[PDB]
Design a protein around this ligand. Structure first.
Ligand SMILES: Nc1ncnc2c1ncn2[C@@H]1O[C@H](COP(=O)(O)OP(=O)(O)O)[C@@H](O)[C@H]1O
Ligand SMILES: Nc1ncnc2c1ncn2[C@@H]1O[C@H](COP(=O)(O)OP(=O)(O)O)[C@@H](O)[C@H]1O
Ligand SMILES: Nc1ncnc2c1ncn2[C@@H]1O[C@H](COP(=O)(O)OP(=O)(O)O)[C@@H](O)[C@H]1O
Ligand SMILES: [Mg+2]
Ligand SMILES: [Mg+2]
Ligand SMILES: [Mg+2]
Lengths: 60, 7, 535, 240, 523
C-alpha cells in the first residue's frame, strides 16, 4: 500500500489492509469496522470474519 | 562517539 | 474496474512481479559498471551545477532520487551495509538483484513462492556455515603484511590505487596508533577518532600523517605568539566575555554614587577568572565559546595562545589525548572557585602552520596517549573528497580485520566454491527446494562474470576454468589447495590469490549474504500493489 | 522456532495462572530498533531505554541504586512573579555565591543516600538540570539520565520498584530501587540503548526488542508478535 | 498514471563521455594559448556589474567565464589551485594539461583500458621530478643582482616590462622588509602586511614603497598639529566615550540634584580616561572606535593629536611598523605599549583628499606600496603584476633553486624520458613516450607566438638537445632563434615547475577515470 503522502506499507493483516485502503461505498465502510471489532475482541481472524460476512451477503 | 569509557 | 471503489490504482498478478524485478534490475545496472579493480567512476551534477565524482555505491544511491519503493529497498540496503560494515556496498545490491531475477523465473513456472523462500533460507544457512571452512587465521600469517595486503585490496579500484603501499602504510600506522586499552577482555580500535583534513595543492604523494592532532583553527589575535615549545593546555567549555546578570536579576539605582563600581565589577569578574587561570602556568587555552577583545589582551601580554570556537568533539579528543580535563565551570566542592595545576594537559609542541594560503594548528607528541591525524593533498576539491571517501573504507577494513582475526580470499574464489558446493548439496534434498537451492548457487556466480566483463575478457571461458578447478578441489582431497585460485584481471587467467595477497574480512561476505537474502525474500513476498492518489 | 517461545514466555511472565482471567497487553512493551536481522530479536526481563545518558564518562555501574526525580535541579524559582533587585556592587557577587551554594546543597543531599543512577522527568517550564548541577553530579560519580517521559513513569515504577520523589526532603534511602546491572550498549551503527537488568524487586513486566534489516520487515514482525500475544491472551480468557 | 523510477534524470555513458571530456579540456586550453610568452596580447573582459578587466593573466581570464561542462569546471579549478599554491604559471599548467589529455584518446580509441594509461602517467611523473631535481642550479640569496635578474625574468612578460628596474626594486625591498622571524623558529613571509594603494593620477614613475604606512584619514579637530617630527604613538581598541552597560539597569530619581549629578559623572569619567591616557605623555592617539568632543577638548589641552575609526588591519600594520601594541583598557597602559620607532608623521593632500603618512621608521616589519598612474584599469593590472613578482620572490627565498626557461627544461626532461623508455617492455612504453613528447607544447607555443617556423626550429632544438652538454639551450622569444640560456639570463624557480607538472599530470589522471554522467537530481 502506498499512501497519498508517499508512505509505504507491506502487510498481511486484514484489518491493517482495510484501514489503509480508502473504500468509498457506505456498505464497504462497515466491513472495516467489523474487522476492527474482531481485532479488539480476539486479535486474530480479522480476515475470515470478512470472508464469512461477504459469503452470507452473497448468498442472500 | 564509540569512545565512552572510564573518562 | 467497476466495483471496489478505492480512489486509486491497483495492480495484481505477474504484472507487479515483473515490474518489481525490472526496477531491481535497473538499480543494479546503474552501479554494475563500478565493480573490481578495472571499474571506472561516475560524475553527478545537480540542478545548480555542483559536481561530484565517485564510485562508492552507497554515495551514488544516496545522491540519486528514486520513485519506486522496490528500488528504495535496495537503496536502504546499501545504506545499512555501509553502516554495519563499511566495505562491499556494491556487491550486495548486485547479489540481491540477481537473486530476485532468478527467483522470478521459478515463480513464472508454477512454483509457489513459499518453497522458493524456504530454499533460499536453507541455502543461505548452508553457505554461511561452509564459509567458515575457507577461513585464514591472521596470526598464522605475518601480521604486518597481512594487514597491508588487506588494506591494499580494499584501496584497489579507487583514485589511490597505484599509491597502495604508501597509503596502506599510513592507514595501518594510524589505526595501530589509535588503539584503545579496554577492560583487556578485548582491545578496541575506534576509527573516526582520527581527523582527516583536505587542502588542495601539491601531489597526493605529499599527504602526511601527523603524530598528534590537527585543528582547523587559527590563533585568536595577531599579537599572540604562534609557536609554543613546552605546552601546558587548558580546555574550557564556557565563554570569556564580560559578565551579564541573568534574566531574573535587574539593577535599580536610587543613589547615583553607586553606578561606577557596578560598571567596574562587571568587567573585573572576568579579569579575575583569567588571572586565576593564568596563575598556574598555562600556555595554551582552548575554548568552545567566544573570547572578548578586552580579554584577549591579557593573553597577549602574558605571552600565551588562545583559540576560540573549537568544536566539542575536537576538544574531547584533544583533552583525552593530552591528559587535560574538560571544565564547564571553575567551581569546586566548596563555594569558592579554583583552578588546579593538576588538571592541565602537556604537549611537546604547539605550532601554527601555513597550508596553501590558509592556516591550521598542529599539536605534536601528546604524552598521555597517542593520537594521529591525516592531511590530504590533491589537485582540487573533487579529488580531495574522493580520496577521503576512499580512505574511510580502508580504515574500516583494517579495523574489522584487527577486531576479528580471520581473512578470506578475494576475486570470486569464494563464489565459485559456494556455487559448486551448493550445486552438489542440492541433490540430497530431493524436493522442490532443490530448484531454489540450485538457483541460489547459480545466482552466486554473477561477481566473477561482472569482473571479467569489466576487464574486457572472456567471461564464459574464465568462469568455466574457475568452476573446473574448484570442482577438482572439492573432489580428490590431496588437491584441496586449489580452493584459493581467485582471478587475475590484468592478464586474464587464474592465480593463487592467497599467495598473491588478495584478502577480505569474512564479515563482509557473511553480512552481505544475510542482508541480500532478507531483501530478496521481503520483495518476493509481494503479490499486489495499491497506490492512492495524492490529495 | 525463535519467536513462539518468546511470546509464550512473555505472556506467562505477566499473569498468575492460578487466578488470571484476562491479560493486560500494555504490560508488555515492544521496542523497534533498525539493524541486524529478525534472528536478533530478544526478550528483556528488565528495563530498556532508547535515550542516551547526559553524563560524559560513566557508562557502566554494578550494584546500582536508582532514584526517580520529579523536581528540578536548578536556580530557585517561585510560582509567583519573582525578581531580585541589586543596588550595590557586593550583591552582584553575593547572588552568584548563594546560587552556587543552593545547587551544591541539593547535590550533597542526593549523594548522602548512596544513589548511583538518577532519572529526571521531562519539564517544559523551567530547566530541569543545569550545567553546574551536571558538573557536580559528574564530580560525585553519578550517572544522570534526563527527559524521562511523563506517561511511562507508571511502567518504570512497576518494573524497577522505585518510588517517585517530588520534594528533596523526602529523598531517603528507602525510596530507591536496587538493580544488578545498569549500562548502555552501542549497537554496530544504529545507536545506543540503556539496559537495566537483575532487579531485586521484579515486577510483572517484560519487554521485547525487535530487530530487522528494513523498516517494513520490522513493522510486519511487530504485528506478527502482537498477533501471537493476542492468541495466547484469548487462550487464557477461554480454556478451550 | 506515469510509472517512473528516476524522475527526469539524464544519463549518458560510453565513449561519448570520454570524447566530450577530452574535447572540453582541449577547448579550455585553446581559449588561452595566445597569452604565453613575451609576445602575448591583452584581453578585455566585460563583467556582469559593468566594469572592464584588461588583463593578460591566465587565472584572471579564466575566473571571469561561466561554463556548463564539468570538465571545464575542473580545469578552471586547477587554475586557481596553481595560482594559490605558487602564484605563477597559471597558463602553462592549462596548456600542459590540455596536451597531456589530448594525447590519450589515440590510445583510448585503440582499445586500451584507461588504467594502463593512468599507471604510465604516474610512472612518468616520478622520472620527470627526478630529472628536474637533477638539472637544478643553486642560488645565493645574498646576491641582490641575481635576485633582481630572477624577478626581471619573471616580469619580462607583463605590461610593467617598460619599468622593470623600478618594479624589481619595489618587490625586493617589500619582501625583504616584510621577512620576519619571531618566538620559536617560525620563519614566515606573510604578505598581508604589505599593503598596496592605488591613487589615480600623476605618473607611473612616481610609484614607490614607503618605510611606514599611509592611511586615508585626517585629524578630528583643526587645531591639532599636522606635522610631528619624532612622535610617540599609542593605539587603542576601545571608544573614548560614555556608553550604556548590558545588565539591564534602570535609574529611579526622586530629588532635584540627582539629574545634574548624573549628568556630571559622565564628564568626570571622560576626564579620568583622558588623564589616564595623558600620564604616558604621548604625541599621537590612534583608535578604531569613536572619540567624543570632550575627550578631543582634553587631548588638545594636553597637546595630543587623535585619529578616529581606523580599520583593524590598518591598526595591526601600524602596530607592526612602529613597534607599539594595541591596548583596550587605558588603565592597563605601560611604557612597553608605547611605540617610538617612527620618524615622521605627516598629513598631506592628494587631489582634494587628505592622507596620513607615518614614515622614516627605524626597522619596520610592514610596508605600503603607493602606485600612481593613468586610471583604475592600468593600476589594477600593475597590482596583479606586482603580486606575481612578490610571490615569485617569496618562492625563491623559501627554496633557493633555479632551472632554465624558454623550454630548455621541457626539452631536457623529454629527452631523458625518451632515453629511459627504450629500456622498457610492454604496452606502457607507448604512453610513457607519449607524455614525454607531449611536453614540447611549451616551446612550440613560444615559437608560434614569436612568429617563426615551428617545424624547423623544434627539430633543430631537438637535435641540439640530443648532444651531451646542451641542457640549457632554448628559444629566444623576441627574435625566433636558438640561444643558450646562460648568456641570455632566463631562470625560474624549481617549485613553480614541480607544481606545474604535478598539477597537470594529476588533472589528466582525474579526467581519464570518468565513464558516465548523471544530471538533474535536485540535491
Ligand atoms: N499449517 C496450516 N495448515 C492448514 N491450515 C492452516 C495452517 N496454519 C493455519 N491454517 C489455517 O489458516 C487460517 C489462518 O489464516 P490467517 O491468515 O491467519 O487468517 P486470519 O488472520 O484471519 O486468522 C485458519 O483457518 C487456520 O486454521
Ligand atoms: N587485485 C584484485 N584482484 C581481483 N579481484 C579484486 C582485486 N582487488 C579487489 N578485487 C575484487 O573487487 C571487488 C570489490 O569491488 P569494489 O567496487 O572495489 O568494492 P565494493 O564493491 O566491495 O565496495 C571484490 O569482489 C574483490 O574481490
Ligand atoms: N625573454 C624570454 N624568452 C623566451 N622565453 C621566455 C622569456 N620570458 C619568459 N619566457 C617563457 O615564457 C613562459 C611563460 O611565461 P608567461 O607567458 O609569463 O606565463 P606564465 O608565467 O603564467 O606561464 C615561461 O615558461 C618562460 O620560460
Ligand atoms: Mg492469523
Ligand atoms: Mg571495496
Ligand atoms: Mg609568469
Amino acid at each position: 500500500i502506498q499512501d497519498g503522502k508517499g508512505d509505504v506499507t507491506i502487510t498481511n493483516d486484514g484489518a491493517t489492509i482495510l484501514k489503509q485502503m480508502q473504500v468509498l461505498h457506505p456498505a464497504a465502510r462497515m466491513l472495516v469496522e467489523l474487522s476492527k471489532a474482531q481485532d479488539i475482541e480476539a486479535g486474530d481472524g480479522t480476515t475470515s470474519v470478512v470472508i464469512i460476512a461477504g459469503s452470507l451477503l452473497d448468498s442472500c | 562517539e564509540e569512545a565512552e569509557e572510564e573518562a | 474496474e467497476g466495483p471496489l471503489s478505492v480512489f486509486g490504482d491497483r495492480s495484481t498478478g505477474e504484472t507487479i512481479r515483473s515490474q518489481n524485478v525490472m526496477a531491481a534490475a535497473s538499480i543494479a545496472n546503474i552501479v554494475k559498471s563500478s565493480l573490481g579493480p578495472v571499474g571506472l567512476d561516475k560524475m553527478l551534477v545537480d540542478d545548480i551545477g555542483d559536481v561530484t565524482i565517485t564510485n562508492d555505491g552507497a554515495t551514488i544511491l544516496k545522491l540519486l532520487e528514486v520513485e519506486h519503493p522496490a528500488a528504495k529497498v535496495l537503496c536502504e540496503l546499501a545504506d545499512l551495509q555501509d553502516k554495519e560494515v563499511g566495505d562491499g556496498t556494491t556487491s550486495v545490491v548486485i547479489i540481491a538483484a540477481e537473486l530476485l531475477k532468478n527467483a522470478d523465473e521459478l515463480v513464472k513456472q508454477k512454483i509457489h513462492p513459499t518453497s522458493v523462500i524456504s530454499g533460499y533460507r536453507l541455502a543461505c544457512k548452508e553457505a554461511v556455515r561452509y564459509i567458515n571452512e575457507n577461513l585464514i587465521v591472521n596470526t598464522d600469517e605475518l601480521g604486518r603484511d597481512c594487514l597491508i595486503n588487506a588494506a591494499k585490496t580494499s584501496m584497489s579500484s579507487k583514485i589511490i590505487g597505484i599509491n597502495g603501499d604508501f597509503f596502506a602504510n599510513m592507514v595501518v600506522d594510524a589505526v595501530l596508533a589509535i588503539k584503545y586499552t579496554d577492560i583487556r577482555g578485548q582491545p578496541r580500535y575506534p576509527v573516526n577518532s582520527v581527523n582527516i583534513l583536505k587542502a588542495h595543492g601539491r601531489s597526493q604523494m605529499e599527504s602526511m600523517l601527523i603524530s598528534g592532532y590537527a585543528l582547523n583553527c587559527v590563533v585568536g589575535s595577531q599579537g599572540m605568539p604562534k609557536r609554543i615549545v613546552n605546552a601546558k593546555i587548558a580546555c574550557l567549555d564556557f565563554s570569556l566575555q564580560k559578565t551579564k546578570m541573568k534574566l531574573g536579576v535587574q539593577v535599580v539605582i536610587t543613589d547615583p554614587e553607586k553606578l561606577d563600581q557596578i560598571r567596574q565589577r562587571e568587567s573585573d569578574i572576568t579579569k579575575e577568572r583569567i588571572q586565576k587561570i593564568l596563575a598556574t602556568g598555562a600556555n595554551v587555552i582552548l575554548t568552545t565559546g567566544g573570547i572578548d577583545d578586552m580579554c584577549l589582551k591579557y593573553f597577549v601580554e602574558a605571552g600565551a595562545m588562545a583559540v576560540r570556537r573549537v568544536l566539542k568533539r575536537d576538544l574531547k579528543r584533544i583533552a583525552k589525548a593530552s591528559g587535560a580535563t574538560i571544565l564547564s565551570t571553575l567551581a569546586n566542592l566548596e563555594g569558592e572557585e579554583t583552578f588546579e595545576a593538576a588538571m592541565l594537559g602537556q604537549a611537546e609542541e604547539v605550532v601554527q602552520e601555513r597550508i596553501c594560503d590558509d592556516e591550521l594548528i598542529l599539536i605534536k607528541n601528546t604524552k598521555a596517549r597517542t593520537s594521529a591525524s591525516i592531511i590530504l593533498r590533491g589537485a582540487n576539491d573533487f579529488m580531495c573528497d574522493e580520496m577521503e571517501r576512499s580512505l574511510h573504507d580502508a580504515l574500516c577494513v583494517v579495523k574489522r580485520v584487527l577486531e576479528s582475526k580471520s581473512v578470506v580470499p578475494g576475486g570470486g574464489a569464494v563464489e565459485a566454491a559456494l556455487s559448486i558446493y551448493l550445486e552438489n548439496y542440492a541433490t540430497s534434498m530431493g524436493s522442490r527446494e532443490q530448484l531454489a537451492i540450485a538457483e541460489f548457487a547459480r545466482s552466486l556466480l554473477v561477481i566473477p562474470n561482472t569482473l571479467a566483463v569489466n576487464a574486457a575478457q572472456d567471461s564464459t571461458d574464465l568462469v568455466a576454468k574457475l568452476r573446473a578447478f574448484h570442482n577438482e578441489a572439492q573432489v580428490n582431497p590431496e588437491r584441496k589447495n586449489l580452493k584459493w585460485i581467485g582471478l587475475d584481471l590484468s592478464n586474464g587467467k587464474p592465480r593463487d590469490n592467497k599467495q598473491a595477497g588478495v584478502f577480505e574480512p569474512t564479515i563482509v561476505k557473511v553480512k552481505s549474504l544475510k542482508f541480500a537474502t532478507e531483501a530478496a525474500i521481503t520483495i518476493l513476498r509481494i503479490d499486489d500493489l495499491i497506490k492512492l492518489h495524492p490529495e | 522456532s525463535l519467536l513462539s517461545p518468546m511470546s509464550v514466555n512473555a505472556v506467562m511472565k505477566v499473569i498468575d495462572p492460578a487466578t488470571a482471567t484476562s491479560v493486560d497487553l500494555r504490560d508488555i512493551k515492544i521496542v523497534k530498533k533498525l539493524g541486524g536481522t529478525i534472528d536478533d530479536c530478544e526478550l528483556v526481563e528488565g528495563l530498556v531505554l532508547t535515550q542516551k545518558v547526559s553524563n560524559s564518562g560513566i557508562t557502566r555501574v554494578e550494584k546500582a541504586k536508582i532514584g526517580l526525580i520529579q523536581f528540578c535541579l536548578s536556580a530557585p524559582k517561585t510560582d509567583m512573579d519573582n525578581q531580585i533587585v541589586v543596588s550595590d556592587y557586593a550583591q552582584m557577587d553575593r547572588v552568584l555565591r548563594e546560587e552556587r551554594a543552593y545547587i551544591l546543597n541539593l547535590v550533597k543531599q542526593i549523594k548522602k543516600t548512596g544513589c548511583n543512577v538518577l532519572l529526571i522527568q521531562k519539564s517544559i517550564l523551567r530547566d530541569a538540570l543545569s550545567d553546574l548541577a551536571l558538573h557536580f553530579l559528574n564530580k560525585m560519580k553519578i550517572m544522570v539520565i534526563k527527559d524521562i517521559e511523563r506517561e511511562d513513569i507508571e511502567f518504570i515504577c512497576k518494573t524497577i520498584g522505585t518510588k517517585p520523589v517530588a520534594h528533596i526532603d523526602q529523598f531517603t534511602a528507602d525510596m530507591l530501587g536496587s538493580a544488578e546491572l545498569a549500562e548502555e550498549v552501542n549497537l554496530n551503527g544504529s545507536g545506543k540503548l540503556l539496559k537495566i537488568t537483575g532487579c531485586a524487586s521484579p515486577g510483572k513486566t517484560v519487554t521485547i526488542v525487535v530487530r530487522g534489516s528494513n523498516k517494513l520487515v520490522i513493522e510486519e514482525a511487530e504485528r506478527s508478535i502482537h498477533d501471537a500475544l493476542c492468541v495466547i491472551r484469548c487462550l487464557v480468557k477461554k480454556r478451550a | 498514471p506515469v510509472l517512473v523510477l528516476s524522475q527526469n534524470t539524464k544519463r549518458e555513458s560510453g565513449r561519448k563521455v570520454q570524447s566530450g571530456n577530452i574535447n572540453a579540456a582541449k577547448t579550455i586550453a585553446d581559449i588561452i594559448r595566445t597569452c604565453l610568452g613575451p609576445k602575448s596580447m591583452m584581453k578585455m573582459l566585460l563583467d556582469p556589474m559593468g566594469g572592464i578587466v584588461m588583463t593578460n593573466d591566465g587565472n584572471a581570464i579564466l575566473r571571469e567565464i561561466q561554463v556548463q561542462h564539468p570538465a571545464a569546471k575542473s580545469m578552471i579549478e586547477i587554475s586557481r589551485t596553481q595560482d594559490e599554491e605558487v602564484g605563477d604559471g597559471t597558463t602553462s599548467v592549462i596548456i600542459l594539461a590540455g596536451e597531456m589529455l589530448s594525447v590519450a584518446e589515440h590510445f583510448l580509441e585503440q582499445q586500451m583500458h584507461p588504467t594502463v594509461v593512468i599507471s604510465a602517467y604516474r610512472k612518468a611523473l616520478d622520472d620527470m621530478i627526478s630529472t628536474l631535481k637533477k638539472i637544478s642550479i643553486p642560488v645565493d640569496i645574498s646576491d641582490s643582482d641575481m635576485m633582481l635578474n630572477i624577478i626581471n625574468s619573471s616580469i619580462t612578460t607583463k605590461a610593467i616590462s617598460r619599468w622593470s628596474s623600478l618594479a624589481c626594486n619595489i618587490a625586493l625591498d617589500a619582501v625583504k622588509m616584510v621577512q620576519f622571524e619571531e618566538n620559536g623558529r617560525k620563519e614566515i613571509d606573510i604578505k598581508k602586511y604589505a599593503r598596496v594603494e592605488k591613487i589615480p593620477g600623476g605618473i607611473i614613475e612616481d610609484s614607490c614603497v614607503l618605510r611606514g604606512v599611509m592611511i586615508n584619514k585626517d585629524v578630528t579637530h583643526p587645531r591639532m598639529r599636522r606635522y610631528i617630527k619624532n612622535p610617540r604613538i599609542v593605539l587603542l581598541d576601545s571608544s573614548l566615550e560614555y556608553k550604556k552597560g548590558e545588565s539591564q539597569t534602570d535609574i529611579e530619581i526622586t530629588r532635584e540634584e540627582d539629574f545634574t549629578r548624573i549628568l556630571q559623572m559622565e564628564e568626570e569619567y571622560i576626564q579620568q580616561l583622558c588623564e589616564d591616557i595623558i600620564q604616558l605623555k604621548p604625541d599621537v592617539v590612534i583608535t578604531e572606535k569613536g572619540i567624543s568632543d570632550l575627550a578631543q577638548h582634553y587631548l588638545m589641552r594636553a597637546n595630543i593629536t587623535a585619529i578616529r575609526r581606523v580599520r583593524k588591519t590598518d591598526n595591526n600594520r601600524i602596530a607592526r611598523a612602529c613597534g607599539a601594541r594595541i591596548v583596550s583598557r587605558p588603565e592597563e597602559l605601560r611604557e612597553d605599549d608605547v611605540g617610538t620607532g617612527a620618524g615622521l608623521l605627516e598629513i598631506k593632500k592628494i587631489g582634494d583628499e587628505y592622507f596620513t603618512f607615518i614614515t622614516d621608521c627605524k626597522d619596520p616589519k610592514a610596508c605600503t606600496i603607493l602606485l600612481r598612474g593613468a586610471s583604475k584599469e592600468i593600476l589594477s593590472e600593475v597590482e596583479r603584476n606586482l603580486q606575481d613578482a612578490m610571490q615569485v620572490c617569496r618562492n625563491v627565498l623559501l627554496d633557493p633553486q633555479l632551472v632554465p626557461g624558454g623550454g630548455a627544461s621541457e626539452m631536457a626532461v623529454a629527452h631523458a624520458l625518451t632515453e629511459k623508455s627504450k629500456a622498457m617492455t610492454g604496452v606502457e612504453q607507448w604512453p610513457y613516450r607519449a607524455v614525454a613528447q607531449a611536453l614540447e607544447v611549451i616551446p612550440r607555443t613560444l615559437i608560434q607566438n614569436c612568429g617563426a617556423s615551428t617545424i624547423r626550429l623544434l627539430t633543430s632544438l631537438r637535435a641540439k638537445h640530443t648532444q651531451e652538454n646542451c641542457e640549457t639551450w632554448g628559444v629566444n622569444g623576441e627574435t625566433g632563434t636558438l640561444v643558450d640560456m646562460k648568456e641570455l639570463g632566463i631562470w625560474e624557480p624549481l617549485a613553480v615547475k614541480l607544481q606545474t607538472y604535478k598539477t597537470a599530470v594529476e588533472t589528466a589522471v582525474l579526467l581519464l577515470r570518468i565513464d558516465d554522467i548523471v544530471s538533474g537530481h535536485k540535491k
